Design a protein around this ligand. Structure first.
Ligand SMILES: O=C(COc1ccc(Cl)cc1)N[C@H]1CC[C@H](NC(=O)COc2ccc(Cl)cc2)CC1
Lengths: 201, 357, 318, 240, 357, 184
C-alpha cells in the first residue's frame, strides 16, 4: 500500500510571539533551511509517497515558500497536497477534515510541519502493520519516542513527558506531561487490567 | 577449601596459560555465607573486583588496603605462634582468592610486597593490639603519602608543563590524569582536552564527565579516529598502571598503539605514574603476563542481528579482549613522578632509591 | 525521457541519503547500467557534447556523495572509453555507438570477474600456518581468505571497527569455513602486531599517490605494520582506483552522526563536548607494500601508470 | 563472623515434615554454625520444647512474648547481636540458591537485600537488582505517586505486581541501631522496607537490593498455600 | 606414466605446501631406459638439474634451451594435428617432469613463456623442417642477444660506475657479476673484491676462482664476517636471480639479509639482472614460493661430532635449507639492466616495454 | 644463535609447562648450534635448524630473539658469537624484542673503541680449507668468531637478579666495578 502523511503546517500554540506575527513558525530557518524543508526531506527520506500540507495562518506565505522548493517539482518522488482553509483552528479539525474529504487510505503519518528527524520509521511501520493484522484492526496509534536522559538540554520543562508502558507488547498505558507537577499520579486499573509486566518511562 | 574457577569459552592458542573468567560466573557458589576460609572483607573485595565495579588501579589498591585494614582489625593471634609468620601464612590464601577473582594489578602486587615487608619487621616482644595499631597506622601513612602527596606533586610538576592555548589528548580512565586536568584548569591554564575511548569498557565517559563538570571544553573520540586528531593534538597525556624495568608502560590496551601513532604525528607522550606502581618484573609484549576479561563483552546490538551472541557454536571462533599491553621504551617521552620528570630509563633507578638503598 | 530522468535522480538521492546498494561492485554495475541507459536515450553529433553531458551528470553524482568515488572514476573511465574510440575513429554515429556499447559490455565482463580472478591469484600469497590481520568488512578479502583456505591452513585476526563493529559479519562468515579466526578490538592492534606475520586488508578508494582511503583505524594498522616491517596486501578491484589526490580537494573524510560513538543517553555533557566520527582514514603509499587487483600484483610506485592506462588529465576535476 | 541468622515465629509445623526444619537445614548447609531462633508465644508458648527436639549442631532458642512483632523481635535481641542480621521465617520453604542475595549484599555493600519469587506493587531499576519503590493500597489513599528525584536519577523503573515477599532479609548494624532508636515500628516488613525506600531517595546514600527468582516460591501463614507445601517438599527435599 | 617423487624428511610447518625431495633418489627408478614418455635430452636435463651439477640460473636456462633445441630437432609431426597445439601439449609433461626434478627458476619460466609465444605464432603455411629451423634460429638468436649482449651492456654500464681504489662486495656464484669484474679488471679499473659465501653450497669459491684466474686481489669470508668487512666495503655488487613486480629481488638466501646489513653500514647495493629474469608474479616473503633443498645437506665435519646424522630419529626435530629469498624494495638501490641504471620501482615498467606494448 | 648452556637450559625447562618453537641457527665458523638443536630436540620444543644466511628470510615470523653473549660491555653493548649483529639488525628492523640471557660475570668495563683489540681471529681453515688450491696464496681470508652489538639493538638483558635495560648497565657497572680499576 502507498504511504500517506498528514502534515500540520500550523502549530496553533501561542508561543513564538511576536516572532510568528511576521512569517509563520514553520518558515523559521534553523541554519539556512526552513523547518518545512527539513520536514519534507524527512518525509521523502522515510518513503512517504503523498503528503497533505495543512496550513491555516499566513498560508499564502507557506504556499509561496513551498511551491518553488524541491517537493513541488515534477522530478520529486514525494507529491504534496496543499489544503488551505480559514475554518479549522486545531489538529482535531484537521483530522476531521481528513475524514470528511476521505484523503487517506491506509495508515498515514500524522506529523507537524516543524519536526527535525532522520528516524527510519519503517520498522515501526512493520510493527504497526503486524499489530493491525494480528489484533484485527484494534491497534490504533504507534507513538514514536526517542531515548534521551532526563537531564538533557533538549527536553525542557514544558515538553517533558512521563509514560507507563506494558514492556512486553509495547503499548501505552499512561501518558502525562510534567508541566507544573512535582508529583505524578498513576492509576491502578492499569496494573489490574494488564498483569504481564509494566514499566514507567 | 577454595576450588579453582571454571574458565569460560574457547581460549586463544597464544593465551593458553593465562586464565579467562566470566562475570556471570562467580566463585562463591560453593562457599560459606559466614565466610570462614576467606575473610568477609576479602570476599567483599573479591566480589567488588570480579564484577568490574572497581577498575582503576589506585581505586583497586585503596580498596585492597581498606580490606587489609579490616583484616588486621579483625585479627586474632593463636597460642604458641608469632604474628610475623602466621600473618604471612594467612594472607597468602587471601591473595590467592583475590588473584582467582581477577588478575591483580601491579599496584596490588607492590602493596602486597610492602605489607609483607612491614609485617615481617614486627618484633615478637611487642604486644598484639599495639603492633596491630602500628601496622594500621603504617598502612594509613603509606596510602596517605603515596596517594595524595604523590598526586599533588605530579599535578604541580604537570602544571609547569601545560601551557596556554594547548590541546591535550587523554585515553581511558585514570584518577591522576583527571586530577591533573582539573587542577590545571582551576589554577589558570586555558586548554581543551580530547578524550580517546575504546571498546568494550567505555571508561572514557568517566573522565569525560570529570572534565565537563570541571568546566573544561571536552572532545570525545574513539581510538580509530585518534589518527584524525593527532595532527591537531599538541600533547598526549596517559595514565600508566605499571612501569617495568626496561621502561615499558603497562596500562590500558590502547597505549602503545596510541603512542606509536602520536610519535608518527610527532606528538610527545606524557605518562603519569606514581613511584609505588613500579615493578622489578619485566615483560616485552602483551602475551606472557596479561589479564583476560569476558569473551561475551565484545558483542554489540547494531540493529537486529547480534552476531557474537551464540559464538560458541563455531569451533574455529576465538574471542579476545586484551586489558594490559606494554610500550617500547623509545616511544614514551615523559614519566612524571613525585620525584620529578624522568624518562622511562629511570623506572628501576627510582626503584633503587625506593628499595631503602 | 521521464524514466531516464527519474532513474538518474533516484540514483543521486540514493547516494545522497544512504548506502544504496550495499557493496561497491553492485554500485559499479548499477552505474554502468545507468550510463548505458544515458547513452542509449540521447542525441549527439560530436563526441565532446556527450563528453560534457557525462561530465555535467558526473559533477552532480560526485556532489551527491564525495566519499563514494566509484561513480566518479567509473564515469571517468567511461569518458576515457569515449576519448579512445573517438581517437581511433577520427584518424561515426551508429558504428561508434555500438562500439561504445560493446566496450561497456567488455567493462561489465571484466567487472563481474574481478573477485574470482583475485581468488585465482590468492594462492600465491598465502602459506600454511600464517597469521593474517584484517580490518573492516569486505567481500574481496573474504573471498580471498575463503579461497586460500581451500588448500592451506592459517589464521586470520579480523578486527572490529570501534564506530560500528562491521567485522563481526566477517568473523561469523569466516568461522563457518574454519579459519581459526580471532575477534578483538582495534585498541589491541600494536598489542598483537608483534605476532602478526602479514596484514591483508581491503580499501574504499585507491588514490593517485598510491595512497588509499579506507575504513577508519587502518592507518594505525599501516603504521604498526611499518614499525614491525610486515608487508601489506590491499585486496582492491580496478574500479576503486581514482585520480583524486589526497590533499588536493576538500570533503575527503565522510563524517557521520556521532550516535555510534557517544549515545544520546549520556546527559547534558553532550552540549559541552565535540564528538566527531570519521568513518574513513588516509593511508600514505609509503606504508603500503603491495596491491592485488584482478590483473595481478602492483606496487604503489606503479599505480600512476595504471592511471595513464585508465584515465586522462583533463577529466580529473570532472 | 559476618552474619547472625534470625528466624522469626509469629502466627506451626503442619505438613509432611517440620516447618522449622527446612530454614534451619538451609542455614546449616551453607555455614551458619550458630543460629538464633525466636520461639512463638501468640498461639501457644510451648513450641520451643518442640524446637529443641531436632538434631542440629547448635540452636539458640529464646522465650518471647505473645503480643510482639518482627521489629520488636529485633529490638529484643539487640544486646546480643554484633554483626549483620539475616532474617528468616518459619513458613518459607525455598529451593533458591541463597548466595545470590548475599552476593548482592556484599558486591554493592547494600543496606538491605531481599529475595522475592513470583497486591504489593514494586518498582525496581532496569538492572533488575536495585529496587526503588514498593507500595500497597492498604496504606495508600491516592492511587500511586512517584518521587521526582528517582525519576531524574533513574529514568526507567520496571514495576512488578505478582511478586511476594519470601521474608529473607539482610540488615546491617546501623539499620538495627536506628530500629532500636525508633520504637514506633512494630512490623519490620512494612517498616524497614518503606522507610529505607523513602530515605534512599535523597551522592552519599544507602543502597537497597532485591533478587527476583524464578525457581520456586514461599508459603503463607493461612491455608491458601498449605496445599502446595507437601507437593513442593515431595519433589524438592530429595536433593537436600 | 610419470609418478611423483616422495617427500624426504620432516617438512617445516610453515613450508608444508612446498615440496622437499632428496638427491640420493631420483624419479628414473620407475622409468624406461629408452625414455618414451619424456625426451632423452629432457631426462638428461632433469638428471643434471636434480643432482646439483647445473645450479646457476643463466646456466640452467641455457641448458634448458639446449635441451629444447634437441627436442625440436628430434621432433616429428603426426597426422590430423597442428604443430602449434601438439607441441604445447607435449612440452607440458616435459616441464612438469623438470619441475618434479627441481623447482624451476624464474628464467626457466620466462623461457617457457617465450617459447610458448613463439611456437604458437607460427603459420600453417610453413612446412615441418622450415618451421623447425625457424624455431631453432629464434631460440639461439634469443639466447644469444638476451644473454651475451645484455651481459655486455650491463658490464659497460657497470664500468662507468666502478671507480679506482674501490672495494666491491659480492655474494654467491653468478656468471654476470664475475664477467663484470673480469671486464672491469681488464679494462683498467684497479680494485679488490670481497667474496661473501654461505653454507651448504659453497659456490662462491667458484667465483673466487673467477677472481684469481683474472688476477684480481680477492678476500674470502662468510656471512658472519660481512658485518666485520662492511665498514671497509664501499660498494656491494649482487647477482639477482629474479625480480618481482613490486621491485623485490628474489635471489640466493643471503642477499636481503646482506642488503639490510649493507644499508645499516651505509653501503649501497647494486643488483645485476636481465629483463628475461623478470616476473609479473609477485611475492613479499620467502614462504609462499621457495625451493627446499635436502635436509641432509646441513650436516658438517667438525672432528667426528656430526650431530645432524640421525636427525630423523628425533620426532621433534625440523631441518630446513632455504635457497631463495625476497628482498624488500626499500633496501636495493640499483638495478643495472641493458636499458640502463633503473631503480627497483622501474622493474615492471620495463616489462611493459618487454611485452611489446 | 650459537650455543650456550644458559639459553638451552632456559628453553629446555621453559618447555616443561609451555609448548612453543625454537629456531636454532648455526654459525658458519663452528656450527655449534647443531649441539643445541639435538639438545633441545630431546626435550621436544619443535626445533628448526637453519643456516646463518636465512635470518632475514625468517625474521618475518620470529616473534622474539632469545640469545646469549660472551661479554657485556660498559655502555650496554655486547660482544657475542659472530653473525648476531646481523640478527640484532634484523630484529630491530622487524621491531622484535631481544632477550640477552646473560650472567653477571660476563659484565666488562672495557669500552668498544679501545686499541682495536675487540675481535678474536681464529684459523681460516674452517672458512676456506687448505685443499682449495693455489688460489689460497692470492686471497685474504679472515674468520672473526665474535661480533659487536650496540645497546640500541638490544631490548632486555636477563641476569640472575632479574631483567635489566640496556639503559641500566652503567648502574650494574658502578655497583660491581670501580672506575679506578678499568686499566687493571
Ligand atoms: O597459533 C597461532 C594463532 O595466532 C594468533 C591468533 C590470535 C592472536 Cl590475538 C594472536 C596470534 N599462530 C601460529 C602460527 C604458526 C607459528 N609458527 C610455528 O608453528 C612454527 O614456527 C616456525 C618454525 C620454523 C620456521 Cl622457519 C618459522 C616459524 C606459531 C603461531
Amino acid at each position: 500500500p502507498p504511504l500517506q502523511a498528514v502534515l500540520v503546517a500550523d502549530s496553533f500554540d501561542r508561543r513564538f510571539f511576536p516572532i510568528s506575527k511576521d512569517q509563520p513558525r514553520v518558515l523559521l530557518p534553523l541554519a539556512n533551511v526552513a523547518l518545512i524543508d527539513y520536514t519534507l526531506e524527512f518525509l521523502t527520506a522515510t518513503g512517504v509517497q503523498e503528503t497533505f500540507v495543512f496550513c491555516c495562518w499566513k498560508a499564502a506565505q507557506i504556499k509561496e515558500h513551498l511551491l518553488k522548493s524541491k517537493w513541488c517539482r515534477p522530478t520529486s518522488l514525494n507529491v504534496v497536497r496543499i489544503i488551505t482553509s480559514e475554518l479549522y483552528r486545531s489538529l482535531g479539525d484537521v483530522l476531521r477534515d481528513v475524514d470528511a474529504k476521505a484523503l487517506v487510505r491506509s495508515d498515514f503519518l500524522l506529523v507537524y510541519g516543524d519536526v527535525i528527524s532522520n528516524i527510519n520509521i519503517t520498522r515501526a511501520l512493520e510493527e504497526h502493520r503486524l499489530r493491525r493484522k494480528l489484533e484485527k484492526n484494534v491497534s490504533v496509534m504507534t507513538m514514536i519516542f526517542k531515548e534521551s536522559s532526563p537531564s538533557h538540554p533538549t527536553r525542557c520543562h514544558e515538553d517533558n513527558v512521563v509514560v507507563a508502558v506494558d514492556s512486553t507488547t509495547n503499548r501505552v498505558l499512561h501518558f502525562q506531561k510534567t508541566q507544573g507537577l512535582r508529583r505524578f499520579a498513576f492509576p491502578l486499573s492499569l496494573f489490574q487490567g494488564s498483569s504481564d509486566g509494566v514499566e514507567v518511562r | 577449601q577454595v576450588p579453582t574457577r571454571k574458565d569460560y569459552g574457547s581460549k586463544v592458542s597464544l593465551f593458553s596459560h593465562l586464565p579467562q573468567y566470566s562475570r556471570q560466573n562467580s566463585l562463591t557458589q560453593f562457599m560459606s555465607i559466614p565466610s570462614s576460609v576467606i575473610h568477609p572483607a576479602m570476599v567483599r573485595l573479591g566480589l567488588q573486583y570480579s564484577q568490574g565495579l572497581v577498575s582503576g588501579s589506585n581505586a583497586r589498591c585503596i580498596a585492597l588496603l581498606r580490606a587489609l585494614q579490616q583484616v588486621i582489625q579483625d585479627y586474632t593471634t593463636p597460642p604458641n605462634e608469632e604474628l610475623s609468620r602466621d600473618l604471612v601464612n594467612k594472607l597468602k590464601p587471601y591473595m590467592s582468592f583475590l588473584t582467582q577473582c581477577r588478575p591483580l594489578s601491579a599496584s596490588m602486587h607492590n602493596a602486597i610486597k610492602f605489607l609483607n615487608k612491614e609485617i615481617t619487621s614486627v618484633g615478637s616482644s611487642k604486644r598484639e593490639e599495639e603492633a596491630k595499631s602500628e601496622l594500621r597506622a603504617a598502612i594509613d601513612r603509606y596510602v596517605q603519602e603515596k596517594i595524595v602527596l604523590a598526586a599533588q606533586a605530579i599535578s604541580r610538576f604537570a602544571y609547569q608543563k601545560i601551557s596556554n592555548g594547548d590541546v591535550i589528548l587523554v585515553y581511558g580512565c585514570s584518577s591522576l590524569v583527571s586530577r591533573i586536568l582539573q587542577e590545571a584548569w582551576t589554577e589558570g591554564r586555558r586548554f581543551r582536552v580530547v578524550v580517546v575511548d575504546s571498546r568494550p569498557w567505555l571508561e572514557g565517559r568517566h573522565t569525560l564527565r570529570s572534565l565537563v563538570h570541571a568546566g573544561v571544553p571536552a572532545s570525545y573520540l574513539l581510538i580509530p579516529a585518534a589518527s584524525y586528531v593527532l595532527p591537531e593534538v599538541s600533547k598526549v597525556l596517559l595514565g600508566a598502571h605499571a612501569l617495568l624495568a626496561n621502561g615499558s608502560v603497562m596500562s590500558r590496551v590502547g597505549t602503545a598503539q596510541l603512542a606509536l601513532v602520536a610519535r608518527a604525528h610527532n606528538v610527545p607522550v606524557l605518562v603519569c605514574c606514581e613511584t609505588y606502581k613500579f615493578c622489578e618484573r619485566v615483560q616485552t609484549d602483551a602475551f606472557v603476563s596479561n589479564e583476560l576479561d569476558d569473551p561475551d563483552d565484545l558483542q554489540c546490538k547494531r540493529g537486529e542481528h547480534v552476531a557474537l551472541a551464540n559464538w560458541q557454536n563455531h569451533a574455529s571462533l576465538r574471542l579476545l579482549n586484551l586489558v594490559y599491553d606494554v610500550t617500547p621504551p623509545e616511544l614514551v617521552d615523559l614519566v612524571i613522578t613525585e620525584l620529578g620528570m624522568i624518562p622511562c630509563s629511570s623506572v628501576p633507578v627510582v626503584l633503587r632509591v625506593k628499595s631503602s638503598d | 525521457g521521464s524514466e531516464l530522468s527519474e532513474r538518474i535522480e533516484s540514483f543521486v538521492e540514493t547516494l545522497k541519503r544512504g548506502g544504496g546498494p550495499r557493496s561497491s561492485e553492485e554500485m559499479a554495475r548499477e552505474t554502468l547500467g545507468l550510463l548505458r541507459q544515458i547513452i542509449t536515450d540521447h542525441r549527439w553529433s560530436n563526441a565532446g557534447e556527450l563528453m560534457e553531458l557525462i561530465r555535467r551528470e558526473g559533477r552532480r553524482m560526485t556532489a551527491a556523495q564525495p566519499s563514494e568515488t566509484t561513480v566518479g572514476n567509473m564515469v571517468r573511465r567511461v569518458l576515457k572509453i569515449i576519448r579512445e574510440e573517438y581517437g581511433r575513429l577520427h584518424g561515426h554515429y551508429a558504428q561508434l555507438q555500438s562500439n561504445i556499447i560493446e566496450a561497456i559490455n567488455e567493462l561489465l565482463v571484466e567487472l563481474e570477474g574481478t573477485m574470482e580472478n583475485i581468488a585465482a591469484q590468492a594462492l600465491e600469497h598465502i602459506h600454511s600456518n600464517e597469521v593474517i590481520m584484517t580490518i573492516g568488512f569486505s567481500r574481496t578479502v573474504e573471498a580471498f581468505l575463503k579461497e586460500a583456505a581451500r588448500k592451506r591452513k592459517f589464521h586470520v585476526i579480523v578486527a572490529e571497527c570501534a564506530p560500528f563493529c562491521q567485522g563481526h559479519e566477517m568473523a561469523v562468515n569466516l568461522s563457518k569455513a574454519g579459519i581459526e579466526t580471532t575477534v578483538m578490538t582495534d585498541a589491541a592492534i600494536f598489542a598483537v602486531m608483534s605476532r602478526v606475520n602479514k596484514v591483508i586488508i581491503g580499501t574504499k578508494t585507491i588514490l593517485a599517490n598510491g595512497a588509499l582511503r579506507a575504513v577508519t583505524g587502518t592507518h594505525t594498522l599501516a603504521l604498526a605494520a611499518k614499525h614491525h616491517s610486515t608487508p601489506l596486501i590491499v585486496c582492491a578491484p580496478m574500479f576503486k582506483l581514482s585520480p583524486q589526490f589526497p590533499n588536493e580537494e576538500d570533503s575527503f573524510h565522510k563524517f557521520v552522526a556521532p550516535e555510534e560513538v557517544l549515545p544520546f543517553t549520556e546527559g547534558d555533557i553532550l552540549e559541552k563536548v565535540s564528538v566527531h566520527c570519521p568513518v574513513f582514514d588516509y593511508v600514505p603509499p609509503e606504508l603500503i607494500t603491495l596491491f592485488i587487483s584482478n590483473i595481478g600484483g602492483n606496487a604503489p610506485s606503479y599505480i600512476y601508470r595504471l592511471m595513464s592506462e585508465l584515465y586522462h588529465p583533463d577529466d580529473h576535476v570532472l | 563472623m559476618e552474619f547472625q541468622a534470625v528466624v522469626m515465629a509469629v502466627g506451626l509445623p503442619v505438613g509432611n515434615k517440620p516447618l522449622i526444619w527446612y530454614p534451619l537445614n538451609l542455614l546449616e548447609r551453607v555455614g551458619f554454625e550458630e543460629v538464633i531462633v525466636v520461639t512463638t508465644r501468640d498461639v501457644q508458648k510451648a513450641l520451643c520444647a518442640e524446637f529443641k527436639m531436632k538434631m542440629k549442631p547448635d540452636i539458640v532458642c529464646i522465650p518471647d512474648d505473645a503480643d510482639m512483632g518482627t521489629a520488636d523481635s529485633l529490638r529484643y535481641i539487640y544486646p546480643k547481636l554484633k554483626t549483620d542480621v539475616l532474617v528468616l521465617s518459619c513458613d518459607l520453604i525455598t529451593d533458591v540458591a541463597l548466595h545470590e542475595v548475599v552476593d548482592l549484599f556484599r558486591a554493592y555493600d547494600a543496606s538491605l537485600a531481599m529475595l522475592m519469587r513470583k497486591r504489593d506493587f514494586i518498582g525496581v531499576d532496569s538492572t533488575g537488582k536495585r529496587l526503588l519503590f514498593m507500595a500497597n493500597e492498604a496504606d495508600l489513599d491516592e492511587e500511586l505517586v512517584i518521587k521526582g528525584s528517582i525519576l531524574q536519577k533513574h529514568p526507567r523503573i520496571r514495576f512488578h505486581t505478582g511478586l511476594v515477599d519470601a521474608h529473607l532479609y539482610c540488615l546491617k548494624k546501623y539499620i538495627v541501631d536506628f530500629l532500636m532508636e525508633n520504637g514506633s515500628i512494630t512490623s519490620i516488613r512494612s517498616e524497614l522496607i518503606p522507610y529505607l525506600v523513602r530515605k534512599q531517595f535523597s551522592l552519599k546514600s544507602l543502597d537497597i537490593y532485591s533478587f527476583i527468582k524464578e525457581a520456586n516460591t514461599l508459603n503463607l501463614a493461612p491455608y491458601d498455600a498449605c496445599w502446595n507445601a507437601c507437593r513442593g517438599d515431595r519433589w524438592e527435599d530429595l536433593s537436600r
